[PDB]
Amino acid sequence: EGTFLFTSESVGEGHPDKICDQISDAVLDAHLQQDPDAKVACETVAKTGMILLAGEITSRAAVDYQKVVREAVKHIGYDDSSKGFDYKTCNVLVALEQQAPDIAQGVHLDRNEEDIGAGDQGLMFGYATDETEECMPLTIVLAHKLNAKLAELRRNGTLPWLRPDSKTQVTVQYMQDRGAVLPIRVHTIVISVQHDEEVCLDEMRDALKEKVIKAVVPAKYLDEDTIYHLQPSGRFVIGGPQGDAGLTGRKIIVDTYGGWGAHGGGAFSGKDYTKVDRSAAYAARWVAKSLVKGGLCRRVLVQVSYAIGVSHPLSISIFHYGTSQKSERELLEIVKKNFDLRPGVIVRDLDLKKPIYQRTAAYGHFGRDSFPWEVPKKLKY
Template sequence: MSIYPKNMFFTSESVTEGHPDKFCDQISDAILDECLRHDPMSRVACETYVTMGALIVGGEITTDAVFDVAKIARDVGNEIGYNSHEYGFDINTAAIFRTIHAQSPDIHMGVSKGEKEIGAGDQGLMFGYACNQTDELMPLPITLAHKLAMKLAEVRKSKVMPFLGPDGKTQVTVEYRDGKPLRVDYVVIAASHTAAYVTSDGKFTSEAVKQEIIDKVVGPIVGDLLDDDTKIVINGPGKFLVSGPQADTGLTGRKIIVDTYGGWSVHGGGAFSGKDPTKVDRSAGYMARYIAKNLVAAGLADECLLQIGYCIGVVDPVSVMVNSYGTGKYSDETLNKLVRKVFSLTPLGIINHLNLRRPNYLPTAAYGHFGRDHFTWEKVDATEELLAKVKNL
């Protein structure tokens, strides 16, 4: 590990699927999926905004698909569990507003270049990262934070802890020694809950609930990384009774660090959810992760950062950069040449290689876009080709 000091504490956070921002991400991606299901060539840039009692879906969509925005939003809300005012939002009674128009003809002209190629749907810089800290080839702090958030949802939906609400956040601080994860120093959990589990003075989440979260959520996930010096805080302000959109306005694309590497790696600034794959913010971000992960999985580096830059309407990237932070088995210049030789980095090349025109985006919209094996950009199927071709450079 060479990005950071060898001895340090590093913190990453995640949020549950019921966090208002993630609620919006999921609606935007559900709409994208519905468009792609009927029209794989759909151009979609969908934004969702939620607040107390109301939800707005807007953006630029050009598609042959015909769909019911309100139904899609309600299906997502009911799946998450936002069907009661007790949890800050009832999707079945909320007002839902639709403000959608077609993609700009200027952007369409730049992107549409015929059947054999397309131009980038936007300018920008995208980063991908991988390291050998975990089996997922992800940094440990964000991996643990995501797994804690998923566990909160699991115990809620399975009725192990039915008094929990959809809204929640997790945070993990990992101590590193000599560049390796040593232990978890701090765990922070924010878990919304019903009024029945507040102390008699109305100020605090009950100690019984806190201990149950420690026993059934924190312990099973963090395990041996916990020790006698680990600090665990459940609902730091006291209680988490007012939650969801009644407590916090939500917006698509506002959790870009949660979505990627938890702050461990750099970020280009572009969000993912609600965007079709001609938007290189999304597709090239996925491709950069795929390439970095395959370089690490092939043993060509212990850690790898990849940057790709694009100009709107232009087919080829304006730049490609590989940084192995001194952990590469070959020079970064050689690894850069290898990447350009093995992978197509045009928008259409990326779309075809990762099969990005199918409706599979809703599952990405909570618990991180990276580190879960069922996405095409998480495959490590390019390692043999990388190892074969690097010898000839």
């Protein structure tokens, strides 16, 4: 009584879906470096030996897709056929067209920037919670940090048997204080990570407990009853796109709040700011974080929605879980007085023409690195 379990997951940089997200954002950044107004909707698919780029780009940039893609795969760490994938020798296929003129004319052609229409219809959510300093659920924060630690240990040579493809999952036991949530302990941790053929299972499991989990999880959350599922499959030599097809926008919950809050369904990666799936979700996080860091609530969910070609949101909704003294209608009035959620204004407030998107494409878009949507707005009311 009083307590509940909640589970979130994360994946590593070499997870095949995350490879695609990073590639799509490497392509977007490559365009934005030359043409800040590039319209980009780049999807990536990865399978054994293949990166395929599909989608719509209208840009003045001259982009060497072979170079951009292969350098992103190189950074991930897939550089030899022994690892199952190699940037030097894989197939890069490109099926990219111009943005449809019907779309262009409906959304941005001949518009003043501040009044550009939403690039599509859709709904988007932002969330924030005071349970961590990052204003993110602990479950997802820990899941991400476990994967980041694996990559650190791989890249510094502490654990040279590690590969790039990894998944993690953290279940935390919580209690609730008046609609806010308070983490008590880590209940279960799962880690699966691709490895070389020479390392034995007990060495891997020992290292994952001692060098990864204990290096990442605050000791106050771990106890003798914590359940560890470390390399639970027994063997994970084949990995990366060879083991499992990857697509852009197939880790949208990993990218956001790990099951907490809500999601409107739109992927982030490979999309420029006129795609409100990305710009308005970023803005909504910025709103949610601003409400919490401003002391107006402890936990909050923000919904916004759009129609293609229409610049203002169709709806805005605030849910505070009972964690404010203000009514949800009062918070909504405060949001409406302080934020302009048109895509052509968000772009200016969050500096969304800057080529920083590849950095967002692993370890979550929120809760790290003081990106502009992570810097709270000082609210007037």
